[PDB]
Amino acid sequence: PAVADKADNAFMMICTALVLFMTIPGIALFYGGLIRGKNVLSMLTQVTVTFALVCILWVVYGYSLAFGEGNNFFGNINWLMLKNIELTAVMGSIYQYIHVAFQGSFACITVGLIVGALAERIRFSAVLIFVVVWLTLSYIPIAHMVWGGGLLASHGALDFAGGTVVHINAAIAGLVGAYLPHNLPMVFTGTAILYIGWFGFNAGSAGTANEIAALAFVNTVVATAAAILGWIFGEWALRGKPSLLGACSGAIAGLVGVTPACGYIGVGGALIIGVVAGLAGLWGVTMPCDVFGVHGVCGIVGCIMTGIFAASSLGGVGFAEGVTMGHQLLVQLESIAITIVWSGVVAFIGYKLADLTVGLRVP
Amino acid sequence: PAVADKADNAFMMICTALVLFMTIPGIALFYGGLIRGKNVLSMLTQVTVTFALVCILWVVYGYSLAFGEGNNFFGNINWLMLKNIELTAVMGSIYQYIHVAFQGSFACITVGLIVGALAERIRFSAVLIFVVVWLTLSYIPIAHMVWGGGLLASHGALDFAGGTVVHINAAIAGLVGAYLPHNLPMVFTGTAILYIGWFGFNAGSAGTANEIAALAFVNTVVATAAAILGWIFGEWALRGKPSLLGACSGAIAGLVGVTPACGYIGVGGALIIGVVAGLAGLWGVTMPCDVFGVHGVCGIVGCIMTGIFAASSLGGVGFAEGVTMGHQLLVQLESIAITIVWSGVVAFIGYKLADLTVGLRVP
Amino acid sequence: PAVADKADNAFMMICTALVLFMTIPGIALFYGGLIRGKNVLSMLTQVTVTFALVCILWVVYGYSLAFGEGNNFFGNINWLMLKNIELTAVMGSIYQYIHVAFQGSFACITVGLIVGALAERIRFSAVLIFVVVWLTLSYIPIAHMVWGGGLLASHGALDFAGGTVVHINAAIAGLVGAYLPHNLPMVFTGTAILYIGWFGFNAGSAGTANEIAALAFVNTVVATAAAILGWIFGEWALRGKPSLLGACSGAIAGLVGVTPACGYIGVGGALIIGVVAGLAGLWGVTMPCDVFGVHGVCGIVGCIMTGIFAASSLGGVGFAEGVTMGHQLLVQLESIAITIVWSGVVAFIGYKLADLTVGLRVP
């Protein structure tokens, strides 16, 4: 019977704290510097309260429905309040309780991304309703499909740290909501906290302190740097000079782009993905809700590029046996399409339920 | 002879840095946003200088007096400047030097809690005198009694991370002192740093990256979330709406409440303790010194509830052999009573000595 | 063949993230609170973009030239884009990829120290040119000479975490540049982030979570505290009262001073080095570019004192076999002299090349 490795337990608990740091206070500060001053306090309150709500829903039934064994779309209700999970139960090479906390931290940042941007325009009670509906019917099934042995995983979709589950998923929810900077030092500080926490997000996705965690770590450093330079170069070419917001946006573009690819590509691949993501991000915003443009565009770019750069010939770890680059690409595209439609439909349902119960627009 | 486990060494060094982060700059920013603007610089200076003083006193004689073998109340002077502690000496499953640093970080946050709140009203030299007296005669003996094999531990008191040693101890010292918000984004940032650092505080209290550290980690996430919701719900019911300060206070209430219980209870217990702590905290402040109301009330609530929720039947790790819930409860109450009187008496002595030497009230 | 230790892999990846945290956002916030308000945005942009540039240069050829085998001054070009480094290659007791990231993080903070201070006065394109020249011809060779088996290491120079490679190297580059506070809460926050990240910087320099990492950790706590008190005492004696900037400067003085010594001295040595560094730092500034006075003076003081306190008789780990204190002192002095001249010459070349190509002074 599988035994827990204390080095992996230590690494994973610290990586979980780093991911939690991305929301509290990372994302809150990022949006806090971007949105109007008069709306900052309310947004910080909404991010904090919804963060709490996600943590509770996760332990009550979220983890069980996302990671329990069930079908292609949902898990089960056998792990309600973590019932039936022995304290010494092992998942991979770490205690399952750590896996519960790590996975929960990803649900939290995904929700923080959406709430932080929409807090300005949405009624408090309406956001709570939306979070409950969307976490339960979008985040949970998509996590199950991708990381819980569901539909996408069973077709061999590659998404190391959440290009689909986190980025595209949140970007679409934010964009559906949108359809329905007073402090740049604060934006920079939030970006910096997101970047440092992202090492736990990306490297921790290996589930162990091995060579894949090391690869994801280095690729995170490289893609982020390449994206900062790509964005800044585009900014200098199009606007005549770099800007602080541009530099921070480029960092996020690279972080998002490398998210699905970090544990599968070589450093050359990380550099290319970083540059392309930084430029795509800049193109995206050119064509606080702009954040959904960066997470959306860059998440799609990253997910597609994972299907290319995972190739051995391109310095990647290699595709699964019997899988051509062409096949992996189709699988990546299908995963992206499914995430977009699934998240969009659920988000629409969430916003509509809130609007029909308490009303959407801030009173 | 006991050998050090490198995974535990790594986990404990990182947890120590996280606890140090709680003081520098966590607590300083929390108070920095709460106190009057004109007093911020002075308070930050006092927190930094007293933090330095604690670090030095700890290494010179503090660690030895708190953790050396002695009697029910004090250790000894055999580890002055860490003399006689071999570099390769092991304490538990980690090098003793790491145990020295981890334990020292708890002394630092306890003192930061007191200094941050009272800096506005106390003379610089008077706070230095108070810190010396109170750390030496209150923090050290209480740490020894609870975690150094002293009186309370010998009676089987349960206090995983310091409901008594840190929270009640500091709350009473602060309240004795009191008897004798200009920047809410800053308060939120300090709260967030305290929360992230608290994973090192709570999970690191296991002394190893095992299933107890994992349990404490998950319970920290759960109790904090439950407290945020409990406080916010009470706020909505009593005031008509949540507030950012309420959300941050609820987070601290849950963190404090779960501190003594985190490594002994089940997640159901963590949820209940979190909700009760959040509500008790709100009731407490209703009836910057208010922080002592939260740490005091919530520390007491947490310490008492540990004596209930540690029970196997309630999902806890179970009480010691031959100990009924009733017995544990009496032991918890006795530990609380002793901490309150001990800290109160020493604090009074400390403030009086400062007042008789240099004068208390800021000149 | 050497195998990777997962505990060391975990510790080193987390220490690397902590070092990265020192630059992003540590150093940026430290300078951000010190420099004029009108120059803050530009400085934050320059620190971020140059951080990205360093990350990319490091992976493309930097790591290979600094850590590959070559001669007394430079490595080689056999590790371009990390080519020829197997994903599972081990360096010491960790995967080589982690060693690449850890080493890269030191290059980043060294450059951040220089850019943050000079951003106010230098043209954007001129700083990029300077960084390329100076990282390539000063940071890389000095790192190779000290930590890559080059000239200084081959003569037994002691420099645990970079008194020469980082501190003196950057201080001289900054001073050559100089020759050619609006937000103290922000300065305090940057200092706090630098301090917490410094545990990864100092303890991670052991390359493993062993007793030397524990020693460096404790010495970091002690020297920092002793320096804060030494500076503050001098400030009280010379100016009549402590100040927040003084307390933060004292912390940095102790951190810099203990950098070369942390893994070689006893806690008594750390206390003495801390006090002397805090006082030397205060004397230095008395006689944002003042930061180069602290890193320069304190780096020299630390490097010299390592040659004294590494002695067994003084509680240190002991000098190499057959090396007297007198010999080690000469070696420390020679290493300091070489670092100063090497960095100064290259910096002058860098600034001149930029001035001849795009012009130095901000347009």
UniProtKB/Swiss-Prot annotation, chains A, B, C:
Binding site for NH4(+): 205
Mutagenesis or variant effect for residue 167 to A: Does not prevent transport of ammonia. Loss of transport activity with methylammonium and methylamine. Shows normal GlnK-AmtB complex formation after ammonium shock. Loss of both methylamine and ammonia transport
Annotated effect of mutating residue 155 to A: Abolishes the positive allosteric modulation observed for binding phosphatidylethanolamine and cardiolipin-like molecules
Keyword Transferase: no
Annotated site residues (Important for optimum substrate conductance) in this chain: 201
Top-level lineage group: Bacteria
Molecular function via GO: ammonium channel activity; identical protein binding
GO cellular component labels: plasma membrane
Cystine crosslinks: none
Stretches assigned to the Periplasmic side: 1-9, 68-96, 149-162, 206-212, 265-266, 311-325
UniProt keyword annotations, A-Z: Ammonia transport, Cell inner membrane, Cell membrane, Membrane, Signal, Transmembrane, Transmembrane helix, Transport
Ranges of the Cytoplasmic topological domain: 32-42, 120-123, 238-243
Cross-referenced Pfam families: Ammonium_transp (PF00909)
Outcome of substituting residue 106 to A: 1.4-fold increase in transport activity with methylammonium as substrate. Shows 80% inhibition by thallium
Activity regulation field: In the presence of high extracellular ammonium concentrations, transport activity is inhibited by interaction with the regulatory protein GlnK. Ammonium transport through AmtB is required for GlnK sequestration. Formation of the GlnK-AmtB complex is influenced by intracellular pools of the effector molecules ATP, ADP, Mg(2+) and 2-oxoglutarate. The rapid drop in the 2-oxoglutarate pool upon ammonium influx and a simultaneous, but transient, change in the ATP/ADP ratio promotes AmtB-GlnK complex formation.
UniProt main location, coarse: membrane
Family in the record: Belongs to the ammonia transporter channel (TC 1.A.11.2) family.
Described purpose of this protein according to its UniProt entry: Involved in the uptake of ammonium/ammonia (NH(4)(+)/NH(3)). Transport is electrogenic. Following sequestration of NH(4)(+) at the periplasmic face, NH(4)(+) is deprotonated and neutral NH(3) is transported into the cytoplasm. Neutral NH(3) and charged H(+) are carried separately across the membrane on a unique two-lane pathway, before recombining to NH(4)(+) inside the cell. In vitro can also transport the larger analogs methylamine and methylammonium. Also acts as a sensor of the extracellular ammonium concentration.
Assembly, per entry: Homotrimer. In response to elevation of the extracellular ammonium concentration, interacts and forms a complex with GlnK. Interacts with GlnK with a stoichiometry of AmtB(3):GlnK(3). Sequestration of GlnK is reversible.
Name recorded for this polypeptide: Ammonium transporter AmtB
Source organism: Escherichia coli (strain K12)
